[PDB]
């Protein structure tokens with residue numbers, strides 16, 4: 213089961229019989245529920261990717277790329293792009309290589325075993341940097357954002373999907389403003405998808421389905437634990453303890469540091485609700 | 491003349507008369523201080539967005555008597571600043587003001603039509619337009635000329651007007667050709683201009699312009715001082731413009747935009763529509 217089937221998605225309403233886990237693992241045979249799973253996951257990614265004219269981009273850096281599904285998809289869609297992914301796992305980089313070669317993308321899509329908090333990437337200035345739920349797993353956040361912003365083209369896009377702590381490593385609204393502002397990163401938009409991700413994750417039969425999943429399919433103690441966290445994460449979004457937010461930012465060395473903090477505060481504290489889009 | 495620009499007051503000030511204070515009929519030093527502070531506060535909404543130490547060239551595409559670019563030139567000694575004006579005599583007066591301050595090298599005023607004529611430089615870091623586009627009918631010609639001479643990532647800073655009703659398309663003398671929210675979205679997006687922010691200062695300018703005794707004050711100005719029919723006409727137009735803001739037939743909006751050739755055109759329209767339809771209230775500012 214490709215990692216992309218196990219990502220978050222956005223659902224506008226909870227669907228009474230929907231279980232993301234049963235559908236992703238093919239345990240639910242409903243063709244409509246499968247198309248809903250895939251659509252919701254594509255819709256979440258699209259909030260970020262629809263901002264970028266990739267026909268005018270040359271290079272993309274995913275600084276926590278997993279099994280490289282996102283850069284593989286972009287590389288298949290835009291044949292001219294060079295895409296570089298970072299992972300901390302030597303084996304995960306090997307699995308990503310295998311997927312990349314099997315799709316003929318080996319010439320321009322790479323996965324490197326590099327620590328994005330401290331290891332420079334291949335290119336001096338990327339057009340787009342992607343991070344789907346990576347920054348919250350990284351302790352040295354200023355070291356990370358220094359490395360990211362140093363290797364981002366002026367005017368280049370940084371596209372993040374990450375969490376805000378409203379009260380692993382949780383980041384408060386005021387901390388996000390400073391992390392972005394200190395590194396010359398100007399938000400174009402924040403989009404709050406908290407409730408819609410909570411809707412996607414809500415599974416009234418979750419514990420039953422997770423057990424049923426573990427006898428039918430084979431899932432490791434690691435995988436089981438990871439899915440338990442996703443369920444708990446949905447509950448935290450429901451309770452508004454956390455927010456799940458999409459950040460569309462650009463490198464901007466020409467805005468004043470006080471004005472940069474003004475406009476980043478506007479978007480971090482008053483993100484656009486997802487339900488008001490087209 | 492610069493004492494006759496608009497300012498922002500957060501609430502109506504009883505006994506404050508922009509006309510009495512500007513001319514000196516009111517000898518209050520505190521009120522004179524308020525008048526200048528309010529006019530600076532309006533400019534600063536736009537000017538505070540730009541790190542001018544990292545800018546090299548500024549284009550004021552409708553510069554009046556060059557007051558704005560002279561001030562910027564004296565604050566930032568490295569800046570080149572170019573102003574455009576339609577008349578012949580305004581340029582001459584501006585250049586004399588410029589030369590009287592030793593700014594002749596760096597600051598220039600040209601008689602050029604900004605809707606059609608190319609500026610001196612091919613790519614400015616900042617383009618300024620304080621109530622200029624409202625006097626320019628050929629909006630697409632103008633914005634093509636502005637954007638094609640703006641650096642990638644450069645700032646365009648406009649003080650201008652959104653028409654909210656049919657009556658607000660033309661407010662006599664002060665705001666001649668105002669366009670609707672949807673027309674603003676198209677004018678900006680078609681030319682690769684992305685809003686960072688819109689700031690609505692309508693009510694605070696109406697507060698600045700409010701004078702319950704304007705008529706009596708205007709007659710005193712004619713009695714004590716000498717003003718021409720063209721001056722008298724402009725001052726009544728400013729009073730009536732303040733009333734029009736109170737009726738909300740138009741909005742006085744500050745636009746902070748950047749040239750952005752890399753954002754998708756559908757997304758560019760989304761984020762420009764957000765700011766034109768939901769501008770930040772000036773009052774929410776700290």
Ligand SMILES: Nc1ncnc2c1ncn2[C@@H]1O[C@H](CSCC[C@H](N)C(=O)O)[C@@H](O)[C@H]1O
Nearest residue numbers: 276277278298299300301326327328329344
């Ligand atoms: N400091 C760091 N440098 C590089 N990669 C990191 C990292 N910290 C976490 N990661 C990577 O982030 C990934 C998991 S975080 C979430 C998964 C990822 N968004 C995806 O789409 O698959 C893993 O590949 C992990 O190696």
Ligand SMILES: Nc1ncnc2c1ncn2[C@@H]1O[C@H](CSCC[C@H](N)C(=O)O)[C@@H](O)[C@H]1O
Nearest residue numbers: 552553554574575576577603604605620621
């Ligand atoms: N098409 C055009 N090209 C260049 N300047 C123009 C213009 N249309 C109007 N202007 C200029 O805009 C100015 C009037 S609008 C006045 C506002 C000006 N920013 C100021 O502070 O004084 C005049 O100088 C006029 O010549």
Ligand SMILES: [Cl-]
Nearest residue numbers: 576625626627
């Ligand atoms: Cl004109």
